[PDB]
Amino acid sequence: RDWSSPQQPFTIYGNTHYVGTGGISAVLLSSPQGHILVDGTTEKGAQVVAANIRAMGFKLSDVKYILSTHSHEDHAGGISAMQKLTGATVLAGAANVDTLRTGVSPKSDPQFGSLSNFPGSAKVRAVADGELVKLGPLAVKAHATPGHTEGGITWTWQSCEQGKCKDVVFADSLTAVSADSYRFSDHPEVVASLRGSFEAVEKLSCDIAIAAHPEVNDMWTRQQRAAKEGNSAYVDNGACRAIAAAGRKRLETRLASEK
Numbered sequence: 001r002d003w004s005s006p007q008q009p010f011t012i013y014g015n016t017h018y019v020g021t022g023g024i025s026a027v028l029l030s031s032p033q034g035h036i037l038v039d040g041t042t043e044k045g046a047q048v049v050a051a052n053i054r055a056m057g058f059k060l061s062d063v064k065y066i067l068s069t070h071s072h073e074d075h076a077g078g079i080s081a082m083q084k085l086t087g088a089t090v091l092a093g094a095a096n097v098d099t100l101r102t103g104v105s106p107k108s109d110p111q112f113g114s115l116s117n118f119p120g121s122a123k124v125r126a127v128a129d130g131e132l133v134k135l136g137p138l139a140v141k142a143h144a145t146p147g148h149t150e151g152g153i154t155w156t157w158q159s160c161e162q163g164k165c166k167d168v169v170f171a172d173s174l175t176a177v178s179a180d181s182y183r184f185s186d187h188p189e190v191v192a193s194l195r196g197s198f199e200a201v202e203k204l205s206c207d208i209a210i211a212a213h214p215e216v217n218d219m220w221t222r223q224q225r226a227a228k229e230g231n232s233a234y235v236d237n238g239a240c241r242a243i244a245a246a247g248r249k250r251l252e253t254r255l256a257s258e259k
């Protein structure tokens with residue numbers, strides 16, 4: 001379950017499908033009008049994402065938007081390739097837009113250096129905090145969740161299965177992790193952002209959470225159980241609270257270990 005490993009795709013809930021790798025989340029939100037893909041995984045994972053979308057019985061040319069959580073290589077490395085395969089527009093938080101266009105992080109990024117560069121993407125533009133991305137029946141809201149990077153966006157929508165509608169959250173990473181030489185102790189505004197983000201996330205309406213790192217909300221456990229109990233296995237409305245709490249506890253640990 002490394003970041004580029006093949007993973008048989010599956011429906012999470014209604015028109016929300018998992019089409020990511022074994023280690024990195026990507027989600028296809030489908031409609032008879034076209035689809036929104038969230039994240040591209042790694043540069044080598046892109047070929048997994050593309051194969052997974054086709055295996056779910058969709059066409060790459062029907063993907064009209066690609067949404068980015070944040071611009072690290074493990075989530076965004078595959079986006080240029082996916083953009084080229086789909087023709088999509090790529091949406092991202094203002095502060096990550098340039099990284100996606102060039103594939104080069106800013107030196108403000110906790111993992112500048114620590115992760116390599118990756119292919120730059122065409123057809124990127126910024127979303128605003130609060131902005132609604134629309135496509136036919138689909139409506140996805142951007143929520144600014146900076147800190148892990150400056151332009152992090154957590155994305156939300158509603159999916160309905162057999163008349164039962166749930167609030168889905170694709171949770172950007174809330175983790176105080178970095179290059180070995182980067183210190184969160186030396187970047188108080190990054191720390192403050194993170195703290196703001198914990199709070200934003202734990203307030204979200206959150207029936208189904210998909211974490212950018214899928215095991216952060218137990219994806220593989222839930223998915224095995226979905227065989228037995230159906231897609232209720234993914235539903236758990238404390239999930240966003242737990243992700244935020246984990247982030248918060250991780251930050252406190254990190255700051256201490258630094259000093």
Ligand SMILES: O=S(=O)(O)CCS
Binds near residue numbers: 072074111173177178
């Ligand atoms: O989680 S890792 O810091 O290993 C990858 C970047 S989000």
Ligand code: NA
Binds near residue numbers: 006007048052
């Ligand atoms: Na696969």
Ligand code: NA
Binds near residue numbers: 009010011
């Ligand atoms: Na399925």
Ligand code: NA
Binds near residue numbers: 010011012
């Ligand atoms: Na399933």
Ligand code: NA
Binds near residue numbers: 070092151
């Ligand atoms: Na973003």
Ligand code: NA
Binds near residue numbers: 208217234235236239
């Ligand atoms: Na959940």
Ligand code: NA
Binds near residue numbers: 229230233
């Ligand atoms: Na069910």
Ligand SMILES: [Zn+2]
Binds near residue numbers: 173
């Ligand atoms: Zn990251």
Ligand SMILES: [Zn+2]
Binds near residue numbers: 075213
């Ligand atoms: Zn990551």
